[PDB]
Ligand binder design. Structure first.
Ligand SMILES: C=C1CC[C@H](O)C/C1=C/C=C1\CCC[C@]2(C)[C@@H]([C@H](C)C[C@@H](F)CC(C)(C)O)CC[C@@H]12
Length: 254
């Protein structure tokens, strides 16, 4: 059975655009990271009370996430069709997808060598313990690491990666969207591109139900999104927390 239509010229163009958009918005040398407020790692081999007292890693990780949100805004703007949406719908989609696209794009620095996000020397190597020093708990972090491993092991082509990030952003089932049908049309064009790509270009056995595995990752992301939001709320109750964040982070997660 399994028909394998060739990518259309339009679908090839969509893929080219998204690759270019990623290459322009994702620096794989992490060369800007020395501009963030510095990482600080307090002794915390154990403590939620101490973590909240210090939030030693929060200014660095908030800057990292803020920077990443800016990059995702830039990427989104280059997604074919995104600019056909109204401004209110663009913003709803960005704010609701931001943490999920950050999680997806971070997969590129994530390494199964030692289950870290390695963005340079020791200073810019991020482990579970660094995320607890920014005030999050294991209810978010452990499923996040499991998600990163699961995604890594799909061995996505860059084409598939950038399409998944685009599909994540242009989702019609986000609360507060107005033109759901237009968003769904944009998404379907990207989804069809991805399905076609996988069937033409992705060798076996990694192609086996790869599309369904990728859609499952999107569902997984909704769950992480909800847990992050719960935890962010609690972190936001810590006095003086706002100075450790950024204006963009406060808006997107507030
Ligand atoms: C964000 C990226 C993209 C570029 C590189 O791959 C590095 C990178 C790593 C991304 C990482 C490694 C550090 C911890 C991060 C930022 C997770 C963290 C749960 C987010 C929270 F800390 C955010 C606030 C505090 C606002 O609630 C989500 C993705 C993780």
């Amino acid at each position: 059975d399994s028909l394998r239509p060739k990518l259309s010229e339009e679908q090839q163009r969509i893929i080219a655009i998204l690759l270019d958009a990623h290459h322009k918005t994702y620096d794989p040398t992490y060369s800007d990271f020395c501009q963030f407020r510095p990482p600080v790692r307090v002794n915390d081999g154990g403590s939620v009370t101490l973590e909240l007292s210090q939030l030693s890693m929060l200014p660095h990780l908030a800057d990292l996430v803020s920077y990443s949100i800016q990059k995702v805004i830039g990427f989104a703007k280059m997604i074919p069709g995104f600019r056909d949406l109204t401004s209110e719908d663009q913003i709803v989609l960005l704010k609701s997808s931001a943490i999920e696209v950050i999680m997806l794009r971070s997969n590129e620095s994530f390494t199964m060598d030692d289950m870290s996000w390695t963005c340079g020397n020791q200073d810019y190597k991020y482990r579970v313990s660094d995320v607890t020093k920014a005030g999050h708990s294991l209810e978010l972090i452990e499923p996040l690491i499991k998600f990163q491993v699961g995604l890594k092991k799909l061995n996505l082509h860059e084409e598939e990666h950038v399409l998944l990030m685009a599909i994540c952003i242009v989702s019609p089932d986000r609360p507060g969207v107005q033109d759901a049908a237009l968003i769904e049309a944009i998404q379907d064009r990207l989804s069809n591109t991805l399905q076609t790509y996988i069937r033409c270009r992705h060798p076996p056995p990694g192609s086996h139900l790869l599309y369904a595995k990728m859609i499952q990752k999107l569902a997984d992301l909704r769950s992480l999104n909800e847990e992050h939001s719960k935890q962010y709320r609690c972190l936001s109750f810590q006095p003086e927390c706002s100075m450790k964040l950024t204006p963009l982070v406060l808006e997107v997660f507030g």
